[model samples]
Target: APPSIWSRIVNFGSGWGFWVSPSLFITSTHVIPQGAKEFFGVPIKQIQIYKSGEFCRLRFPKPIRTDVSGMILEEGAPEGTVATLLIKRPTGELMPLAARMGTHATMKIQGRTVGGQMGMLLTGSNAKSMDLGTTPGDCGCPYIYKRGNDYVVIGVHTAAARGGNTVICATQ
Candidate 1:
């Protein structure tokens, strides 16, 4: 039988969050917490800080041998950085996609209260926005754009808002 998509994409053996960023591929900085390092067996840090594409040509700290739960970058990566993302849409296609900032909106998840001031503008100025919805166990997920013929990534799911809403603006 052929390998399932879930099996092909996920590292089921270990407890890690495999995610692809908009610019580069990243894993949890601290794969194993200080206390649980021995119990879980140190995880291999696959994919280093700098490199290009999702392939293995990139250099990583160590060979990753665990399950990936989430992936988020330190900050918005600068331009010209090598990224390891999957293209949802085919190449050489044109589509109408607009990026803008919108007011932040607060949400509740996993009985924890967090906050941020960044929202993804979907439709009009105040139509819909993309906010962080994952819990503590899922943090390294990348947000990709699914337009006509472009599966371009936009941002990473960082944190949630504290109160009412957060502010999400445009990026250059």
Candidate 2:
């Protein structure tokens, strides 16, 4: 069997996060509590929050374990591009949810604003696979786009909006 890309998905506090590099983990700021010192038992050396308020970059004191793969961050995809949203399960398996890229627009979510060129817009609409809308544990999951045979992470899952039809993602 091929190496599972799901290995890059990690637990950020209680929610999901993606490992972008050995020294860096990306997640939604809302999922991490203020003054957090560690994440999923990993000692965090530093925290960099994007001004957008939906995303955060965590630095570890030591490099992450090499047993798992990491994600490659990329610019947002064009409108109408089809992508996959990674969801983790208790069975240690990853479920792929089909999501389509929507227009470029800023969104006010949970009292925070997320938008700009670095902000990736998503309708968060897909088949009603597990549920019809984004759930609590969905935050910080990678919104990946396939570039040839490689996976490019275009956005970080944030919050659901507009009656669960629109999802706001943070980039950069």
Candidate 3:
């Protein structure tokens, strides 16, 4: 892996936040919008976003005459939805069905207060469990998936809790 992937979506000075332990990544709504505009006289628009094991790839529907190689986001898709991304492994290996339903967690800035529904908790897999020690910036990191693939993005870890080591994911 190239340590991390590049992100086309920039958060001004904030950039995007991602955590490696749980393999989760997230972007602020203010940072990414559903429109187009001009930045420094350069036109920009949303395009298809892809992530390899080590690098982030951006494919514009229409070619733009600009050098935005390092200005990309390393995210599969926006938060929400069970069937979000359909990714292919970097090794050109087809993902097995077990890999698809292995395990995942959804990290949200705000939501219900239920223990199982909110925060970092393991789901899917033969042994459904939860990790109570996840913290912020843990998003966009890879969670454990030892069954099929050595490193399949099972869940993305979130930030720490106020009084404890509470962690959250994108699935649970």
Candidate 4:
């Protein structure tokens, strides 16, 4: 099946963002373009930075409809566990890339400090192979882990590992 909670993910300028709740959306801080006013059609009322500028919480002006009944944002992914990295194309088709849980690490990009990163290595048949380059709007994508029937977000995609490989920097 396609990635769960796929409807919640939306285009944010050159990147992506997803609704965690009816009123709250999550994305990487670097994904947002400067002076942006809203995401899609939802008017952004507030922006909250979460630790060292790795992540951002965007609050809508009011509660909007969301298809996130079984999805949540919480940090819990054991090493080597398989997960999915949600992405979208310029054509707006949603896709899921296979990923494997990795150890916590630190990263820095765009001059922002990002730590406590729950890194994940892109794997499976759909991986970009050894090409660490991100597609357009790949930043702010969600690295999701399935627990039983629930989809939990370990973190959002902040950047790729500078050292190489398709390592995902999970910016909480």
Candidate 5:
């Protein structure tokens, strides 16, 4: 599929993950699984595990804190929910993202469907996925929704443009 308008980049490999514990983060299996052999790049210390077919956990050298302290974690979010995405590029720049759910989108891994998710809506940012752009290195970014005072993670961004009008996500 085509990359989003402006994509994220990484020093070695561009991917996204979130802090699950004081010493661990979760990211897409495709990014650092035993299945991938390696990132095919350099400056790597290898920090991935195959927890399941879809995802894995990356341990951190130092303890980290999670902002999901007041957020909810479940299989999916309600339809019509609006989400915010904060993505990082290889150049070390962070961009703000915006998207909506309920377009009945399916998440794909390596061009294969792994599951379905509350999808990205068409009709923004130049008219389609306005603030929601999935670039070349956005494989493991988190999909978060702003709920009152907290930003809760609803899923991990897996596939872009699953449908002509959606960005597919893997639910929490």
Candidate 6:
């Protein structure tokens, strides 16, 4: 898919998504709070669930294993592969990011140390650690992998713990 196609981000409260094909799209899901709908103002059942934005292109995955959780998906993007992510901001604009995939890195959020071993966006927008160019609503943004000069669809921005060297993406 075209790299520009990565801009198709939508909201589901628990996640954010974008299309890869006309019939399918990739998205992420987070734990919903005790009694919330899709989000505080949205209803889960009322969500379009699946939709499209031009050309393009899941099940509720079981609990992902913590220790080995990122292995299988991490392999999808070979080490040294560079990537670009299109993260949406609350202001309704798509922010582009450049990243390098390799090595493990960690960060601290809310006093707890976390890891971003999968991949790290080589940027935090002219800033440093915890100052990643992204925000909370950008969590599930999809990253378009740049392989040999062409952009290919392969990963999703999953975590951005401040102070880490990587933005962390899930390729599965």
Residue pairs clashing, model 4: none
Per-residue CA lDDT of model 6 for 1-172, tens digit only, reads 4434644556544557664533344554431235565432345464344312111113222321122112111234667777777776656666677777765445555355544336666775443432356565566677667556544656566565555454666544
Q: What tens digits encode model 4's per-residue C-alpha lDDT throughout 1-172?
A: 3444777777675688777887777787667788766665655455443544467776666577555553577763777878777776667766676666677776664455565455545544333433333453587777777788777777677776543334554544
User: How high is each candidate's TM-score?
Assistant: 0.34, 0.76, 0.30, 0.75, 0.63, 0.59
- Flag regions of model 3 displaced more than 4 Å: 1-44, 48-144
TM-score-based ranking, best first? 2, 4, 5, 6, 1, 3
lDDT of 1 by residue, 1-172 (tens): 1121122122212212233322224323222234332221333343344322111111334434334322333333333332222111123121222323333434453354333224532334442232212223223233333344434443333342333122221111
In candidate 1, position 52 carries an lDDT of: 20
TM-score of 2: 0.76
* Models, CA RMSD each: 11.3, 3.8, 12.2, 3.6, 7.0, 9.7
RMSD of 1: 11.3
- Superposed model 2: Cα runs more than 4 Å off: 1-3, 40-52, 90-93, 110-112, 116-130
TM-score of candidate 3 relative to the true fold: 0.30
Write the residue-wise lDDT of candidate 2 on 40-158 in tens digits: 57654554444345667766666765665566777566777777777775566666666677765677766777662232234343422445455667788877778788777776787
Where does the lowest 10-residue lDDT sum fall in candidate 6?
Answer: 64-73
Better of 5 and 6 by lDDT: 5
- Cα lDDT tens digits, model 3, 63-169, are 44333322222222223322111112223322111212222233333343311112322223221221322223223333233323233333333232343323333
**Candidate 1 displacement at residue 140 in angstroms:** 1.1
Please give, for residues 1-172, the per-residue lDDT of candidate 5 as tens digits. 0122113122223466655444555566555434444332322365544444344445545443432232344454678887655566666666656677764444554567765465654445442332346664666676666577554666566666534346666654
Q: What are the lDDT figures for the candidates, one per model?
A: 0.29, 0.66, 0.29, 0.64, 0.53, 0.51
